[PDB]
């Protein structure tokens, strides 16, 4: 189907107690397969997933260093942007870069991003087109002018245009045993009697991969919508994912509801009956 | 450095089938589209389909879907171009050409001429 | 389908001369990406087509700097600046925005005496 690759950085300040921490990961779909920790013994670039290690150790030289580099941005960025800010050196603050590409179907391009944010904020981010810059307040127009002088822009579309495709393309395929897989949900359901004449309905959805997924109880076709209680899809640590949905009924009316499972590995929705 | 070779020249007599053959190297074969093109003694190119290998999806010119069948071999590196019922329409040479990120057909194949002639 | 027409079909002109051709596309040729995929082709006869321009004004790598590709929507321009002997040949414009992709019907560059 469609298919994504992103890297996510995490630059925290910690003031009084040395280094701020940097930890960065790579995912492909839903499928985390690098980390780096500035504070690991390593100080290297590490697999993550049985695939990657197909990689030589060209691979894994260049991605640390890489790493490092990105590191050292970060770490002067905390200063400047304090300054920026005109934020004293005693509070710790928390930076955030995330980017990445996405292709279709046909694995042709369909679009990239790079976005930044201080303190948990939207900072900076490239826009649709990969040519222009989103800058939040007063902070962000002047990193916008500076980056808009250096042509930072198309350095990055190259990326998010060529390098990026290029890369997902070759980890889709090391990976195909499990990143071109699809694990289709197990479900049952579950009657649990709270009241005299209530009674909790729950629709569980287990062991599939990729997470997306749509949970939905109805009762006489129509979705109840308000009165559903849906938790945050979940990772079961294994690969696969859970998410369960349940609604509070008046008892004697099970066979009213009825419970809709929409997945990608799933040919035709479920639709699971009380009878 | 890029390289797309393809299979010589054929004659066939209606009714009959072809496979025209296209070995890559000097690159990832399983990344890029290899999309194949006819060229009729008339004038213009047009465009038969293309094959991604790995997943091997395909998609066809609905001008010759249900005619020609387009397929792969990873551990040859190779492409195959198969066009069925032949009919005199079909005359014309077939190339393959690889496609870069960038959606183009970057680099071509010599070129197969394929008759059908009774 | 989309078609793609160029104009002129014909064309005669000496080294040393600027030659425009001219494709035009029966609707627009963008793609949901923001991209659009016309590209540019040359051909001598016998042989396989040689890339020129893709999406629409970058060159491919190794072409002389004197071909250039431009326009956006429905027309889009090649020039050849200041021809040279090895520039007589037919050119086809290409799209690849949507499906199915479609060629334009060749412009053919001859010598003029």
């Known amino acids: 189907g469609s298919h994504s690759m992103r890297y996510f950085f995490t630059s925290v300040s910690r003031p009084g107690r040395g280094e701020p921490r940097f930890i960065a990961v790579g995912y492909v779909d839903d499928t985390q397969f690098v980390r780096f920790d500035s504070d690991a013994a390593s100080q290297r670039m590490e697999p993550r997933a049985p695939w990657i290690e197909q990689e030589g150790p060209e691979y894994w030289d260049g991605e640390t260093r890489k790493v490092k580099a990105h590191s050292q941005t970060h770490r002067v960025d905390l200063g400047t942007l304090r300054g920026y800010y005109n934020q004293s050196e005693a509070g710790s603050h928390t930076v955030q870069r995330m980017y990445g590409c996405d292709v279709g179907s046909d694995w042709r391009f369909l679009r990239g991003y790079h976005q930044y944010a201080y303190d948990g904020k939207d900072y900076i981010a490239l826009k649709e087109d990969l040519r222009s810059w989103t800058a939040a307040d007063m902070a962000a127009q002047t990193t916008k002018h500076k980056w808009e002088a250096a042509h930072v822009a198309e350095q990055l579309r190259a990326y998010l245009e060529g390098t990026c495709v290029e890369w997902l393309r070759r980890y889709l395929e090391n990976g195909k045993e499990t990143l071109q897989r699809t694990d289709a949900p197990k479900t049952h359901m579950t009657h649990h009697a709270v009241s005299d004449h209530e009674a909790t309905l729950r629709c569980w959805a287990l062991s599939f991969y990729p997470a997306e997924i749509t949970l939905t109880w109805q009762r006489d076709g129509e979705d109840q919508t308000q009165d559903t209680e849906l938790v945050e899809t979940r990772p079961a640590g294994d690969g696969t994912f859970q998410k369960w949905a349940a609604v509070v009924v008046p008892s004697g009316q099970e066979q009213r509801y009825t419970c809709h499972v929409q997945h990608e590995g799933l040919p035709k929705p479920l639709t699971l009956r009380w009878e | 450095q890029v390289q797309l070779v393809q299979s010589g020249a054929e004659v066939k007599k209606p009714g009959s089938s072809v496979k025209v053959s296209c070995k890559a190297s000097?690159?990832?074969?399983?990344?890029?589209?290899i999309h194949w093109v006819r060229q009729a003694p008339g004038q213009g190119l047009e465009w038969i389909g293309w094959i991604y290998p790995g997943n091997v999806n395909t998609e066809y010119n609905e001008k010759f879907k249900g005619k020609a069948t387009i397929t792969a071999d990873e551990s040859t590196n190779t492409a195959y171009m198969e066009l069925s019922s032949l009919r005199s329409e079909d005359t014309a040479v077939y190339y393959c050409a690889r496609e870069e990120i960038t959606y183009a057909m970057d680099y071509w194949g010599q070129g197969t001429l394929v008759t059908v002639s009774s | 389908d989309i078609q793609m027409t160029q104009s002129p079909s014909t064309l005669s002109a000496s080294v040393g001369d600027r030659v425009t051709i001219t494709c035009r596309s029966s609707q627009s040729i963008v793609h949901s990406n923001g991209n659009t995929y016309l590209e540019w082709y040359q051909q001598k006869p016998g042989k396989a087509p040689k890339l020129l321009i893709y999406?629409?004004?970058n060159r491919f790598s190794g072409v002389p700097a004197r071909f250039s590709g431009s326009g956006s929507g429905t027309e889009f321009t090649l020039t050849i600046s200041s021809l040279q002997p090895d520039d007589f040949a037919t050119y086809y414009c290409?799209?690849?925005?949507?499906?199915?992709?479609?060629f334009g019907q060749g412009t053919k560059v001859e010598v003029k005496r």
């Open positions: 999406k629409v004004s």
């Open positions: 290409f799209q690849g925005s949507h499906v199915p992709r479609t």
């Open positions: 000097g690159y990832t074969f399983t990344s890029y589209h």
